Amino acid sequence: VSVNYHFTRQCNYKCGFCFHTAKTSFVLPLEEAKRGLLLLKQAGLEKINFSGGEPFLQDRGEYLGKLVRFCKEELALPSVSIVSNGSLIRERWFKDYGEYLDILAISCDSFDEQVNALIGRGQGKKNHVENLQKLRRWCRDYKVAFKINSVINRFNVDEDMNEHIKALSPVRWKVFQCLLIEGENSGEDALREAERFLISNEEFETFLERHKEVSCLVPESNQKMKDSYLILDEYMRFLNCTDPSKSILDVGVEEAIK
Ligand SMILES: C[C@H]1O[C@@H](n2cnc3c(N)ncnc32)[C@H](O)[C@@H]1O
Ligand code: MET
Ligand code: SF4
């Protein structure tokens, strides 16, 4: 019914906890991605979420825009979403592709710009929060629903974001407990080592209680992510958050799900 397509692993940020790291530079040929997306449509997909990696990095966002247009215009998917760090989104992308996009979720873990910088949620300019605010205004002007995703971690577990989130008035505020995935952000050879970012379930629940007045908050605990977050990787193989499947481009959707 719903799928997270991490179609690229390249990114311009350096988030210390990143759980889907730059292990490859492979992106499928556009027509191959279209072929697999059609299979998903034929298997009953109704909601697609483009992720990564940074979705807007590949071909300056043009690759992503073509797949978004394909999903809306050719596959007639009623819900097409992107999750992005926001830093590379050009207004021209909205002009060219925004009519095909339902939802843009921007990842922002703190409203203290210095906290984002220290976490690696940036590329040096230390203006990640201010960019989030501009993207809100573009979503309003181009009629795209705006969501914000935050990873709750050691450095923001005590932050009060109530007034900041209410002022941004997002459709949904998705709040992820920092998640460890072996081979991604855990291991001597991993590109990231996220252990120092982790928080306990009790700490996570405390953050949620602090923000109980935010009615658009939606929590994503570790257990929820393990139970319900499905990944389609850059080869269109299925992965979970707990070897990859065969690619749907080889064995089809059904055999790949097992
Ligand atoms: C796809 C979503 O995953 C979030 N994200 C990135 N790394 C982690 C992690 N270690 N734990 C939980 N969420 C994470 C991104 O910030 C984005 O919002
Ligand atoms: C592993 S996160 C992938 C989506 C995007 N890079 C973000 O952080 O919002
Ligand atoms: S979590 Fe950070 S480093 Fe990882 S892909 Fe998203 S923006 Fe890039």
Protein topology:
Layout: E1 2-6, H1 30-43, E2 47-51, H2 62-74, E3 79-84, H3 91-97, E4 103-107, H4 113-119, H5 128-141, E5 145-152, H6 162-168, E6 172-177, H7 201-210, E7 217-220, H8 222-228, E8 231-232, E9 238-239, H9 248-257
Parallel strand pairs: 1-2, 1-8, 2-3, 3-4, 4-5, 5-6, 6-7
Antiparallel strand pairs: 8-9
Bound molecules: 5'-deoxyadenosine, methionine and iron/sulfur cluster.
Strand proportion: 15-25%
Kindly name the structural category. alpha/beta
The major beta sheet can be summarized as: 9 strands, mixed
Count the E strands: 9
Bound molecules: 5'-deoxyadenosine, methionine, iron/sulfur cluster
Shape: globular
The share of residues in helices is: 25-40%
Order of helices and strands: EHEHEHEHHEHEHEHEEH
Number of domains: 1
Sheet with the most strands: spatial strand order? 7-6-5-4-3-2-1-8-9
Please report the number of helical segments.
Answer: 9
Rg, nearest Å: 18 Å
| Termini separation | 16 Å
PDB class: antiviral protein
Keywords: radical, S-adenosylmethionine, iron-sulfur cluster, antiviral response, antiviral protein
Assembly: monomeric
Entry title: Crystal structure of viperin with bound [4Fe-4S] cluster, 5'-deoxyadenosine, and L-methionine
